[PDB]
A paper describes a structure:
SpOatAC crystallized in both the native and SeMet derivative forms and crystals diffracted to 1.12 Å and 1.8 Å resolution, respectively. The native enzyme was refined to Rwork/Rfree values of 15.0/16.8%. Ser438 is engaged in an H-bond network with His571 and Asp568 and the triad is positioned in the center of the putative active-site cleft of the enzyme. The oxyanion hole structure in SpOatAC is distinct from other SGNH hydrolases. Whereas SpOatAC possesses the Ser nucleophile and an Asn in Block III (Asn491 in SpOatAC), the conserved Gly of Block II is replaced with a Ser (Ser461). Moreover, rather than forming a type-II β-turn, the residues of Block II in SpOatAC adopt a type-I β-turn resulting in 180° rotation of the peptide bond. This orients the backbone carbonyl oxygen of Val460 (rather than backbone NH of Ser461) toward the active center where, together with the carbonyl oxygen of Val462, it coordinates a water molecule (w1). Another distinguishing feature of the oxyanion hole in SpOatAC is the positioning of its two component residues, Ser438 and Asn491. The Nδ2 of Asn491 is positioned 3.4 Å from Ser438 Oδ, a distance significantly closer than the average 5.4 Å reported for the equivalent distance between the homologous residues in SGNH/GDSL hydrolases.
Author numbering: 427 to 605
C-alpha cells in the first residue's frame, strides 16, 4: 500500500504558518504556495500520486482564494483522492463579513464539513471555527492572513498548525479510501 507520511498541499494561509506547521509536524512534507487554490491542489495531488510521491495522509489547505466554484472543486478533489489515502480538509476563513465573497467562503467551509462528516476516509481541520474563536489574531490584518505583529503572527500560526495536528490525531484510527 501507500507509505505512511503526511503531505500538505496549501495556499497562502498555510504558507504563512509554514514554520509553525513544520514544528508541530516534524517530518511532514509542507508544500504551500501563494497562488494555490482548491483547483490547483487537486492537480498537484494527482501529479504527486502519479509520480508515487504522495504519502498516505493528504492535507488540503485551500479554499479562501477563488472560492466561487467551491461545490465542484471540493466534490472533485474528494472524488479524485486516490485509493490508499486519508484526506484532511482545512476549512477556509475570510473574516470580513462584508466582503462580497464572505458568504461563499462560509458556504465552502460548511460544505467541506458535510463532505468530512459523511466520508469515512476524510477528517476536518476546522480552521474556520478556530479563527472565529480568536479575534486577537485578526486585529490589524486583512482578515485572512493572521497576525499583524510578530507575537500575533506566531500565535496565529501555532493555532493554525495545532488545528491540523489535532486533525491528524483524530485521523489516526480511521480508514483510507479503499475498494
Ligand atoms: Na469522516
Amino acid at each position: 500500500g501507500i507509505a505512511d507520511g503526511t503531505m500538505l498541499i496549501g495556499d497562502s494561509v498555510a504558507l504563512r504558518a509554514n514554520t509553525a506547521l513544520q514544528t508541530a509536524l516534524p517530518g511532514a512534507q509542507i508544500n504551500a504556495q501563494v497562488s494555490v487554490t482548491t483547483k490547483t491542489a487537486n492537480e498537484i495531488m494527482l501529479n504527486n500520486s502519479q509520480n508515487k510521491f504522495l504519502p498516505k495522509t493528504v492535507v488540503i489547505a485551500t479554499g479562501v482564494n477563488n472560492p466561487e466554484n467551491y461545490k465542484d472543486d471540493w466534490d472533485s478533489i474528494v472524488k479524485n483522492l486516490p485509493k490508499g489515502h486519508h484526506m484532511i480538509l482545512v476549512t477556509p476563513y475570510e473574516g470580513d463579513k462584508t466582503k462580497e465573497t464572505y458568504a461563499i467562503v462560509e458556504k465552502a467551509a460548511a460544505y467541506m464539513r458535510e463532505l468530512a462528516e459523511k466520508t469515512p476516509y476524510i477528517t476536518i481541520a476546522d480552521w474556520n471555527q478556530v479563527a472565529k474563536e480568536h479575534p486577537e489574531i485578526w486585529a490589524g490584518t486583512d482578515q485572512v492572513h493572521f497576525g499583524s505583529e510578530s507575537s500575533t503572527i506566531e500565535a496565529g500560526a501555532k493555532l493554525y498548525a495545532d488545528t491540523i495536528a489535532t486533525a491528524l490525531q483524530t485521523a489516526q484510527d480511521k480508514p483510507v479510501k479503499s475498494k
